[PDB]
Amino acid sequence: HRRLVCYCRLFEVPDPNKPQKLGLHQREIFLFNDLLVVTKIFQNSVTYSFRQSFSLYGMQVLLFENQYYPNGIRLTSSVPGADIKVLINFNAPNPQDRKKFTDDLRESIAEVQEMEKHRIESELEKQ
Amino acid sequence: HRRLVCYCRLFEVPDPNKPQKLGLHQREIFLFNDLLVVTKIFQNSVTYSFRQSFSLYGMQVLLFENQYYPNGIRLTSSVPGADIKVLINFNAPNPQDRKKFTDDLRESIAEVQEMEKHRIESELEKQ
């Protein structure tokens, strides 16, 4: 039982230190209760398109602003025993969208953390 | 300015006269105000996945029920001067979902028809 929490659009930013053309790397962003999916914008046709999906377990959201990306969002994966990975950087069209999306995202991260906690603790109680 | 009208899940039905295993050909369905997008369910990873997009201009919705597909939806493309094309058949999990989705779809079809009407009539007024 999956549920869509937020649909929006964000520009992907492969390098938050370098400028890039306005409107480049636009993405359809689908935030579900237990997944984040990123894909190319939508054109009819039957095509094979690119699809980044990210687990919400261990995901952290960092808000950032610089002269080239005034509505930054950096997503990283941080789990016990591993190096922190940078998953993807975005820039939102406006801060309203930024606030909104990242707020929904954190909430959904917290939901996944607690479900996974209960699962892990439940397994241990079996043994 | 695109807007998500309805996210839901439907089973694709390549042949509404033949039975098929429960849960087969599940699809993520995204209904926008000016587009319908169908794609494979969601698993993290970076993958190349299949994507059917359909224009809403000239789309017609036929509700159907038989012994193998009790919540049928047939979509066809009907424009002036062309043979009618069958675009895709679905089966909804339950009639609540069927009613809801198809109601949103018709509404969005009507919106596209009227926007396109205004565009066509506007072009003619130029000439």
Residue-range domain boundaries for chain B: 1-127
Q: By C-alpha distance, which of A5, A76, A67, A64 is closest to A34?
A: A5
Spatial contact of B72 and B64, defined as CB atoms under 8 Å apart: yes
Spatial contact of A10 and A29, defined as CB atoms under 8 Å apart: yes
Whether residue B47 and residue A54 make contact (CB cut-off 8 A), yes or no, is: no
* Nearest-CB residue to A48 (from B2, B37, B48): B48
Give the residue from chain B lying closest to A56, CA to CA.
Answer: B44
Whether residue B7 and residue A4 make contact (CB cut-off 8 A), yes or no, is: yes
Quick one: resolution in A? 2.4
Cα angle: B59, vertex B60, B63; to 5 degrees: 145
Q: What is the CA radius of gyration of chain B?
A: 16
Solving technique: X-ray
**Dist CA A91 CA A20 (whole Å):** 11
* Nearest-CB residue to A44 (from B2, B46, B54): B54
Whether residue A35 and residue B55 make contact (CB cut-off 8 A), yes or no, is: no
The label of the residue with tokens 């939102």 reads: A92
Q: What architecture is domain A1-127?
A: Roll (2.30)
Q: Is residue B13 classed exposed, middle or buried when 0-12, 13-18 and 19+ CB atoms within 10 A define those classes?
A: buried
Question: Minimal Cα–Cα distance from A7 to chain B, Å?
Answer: 7
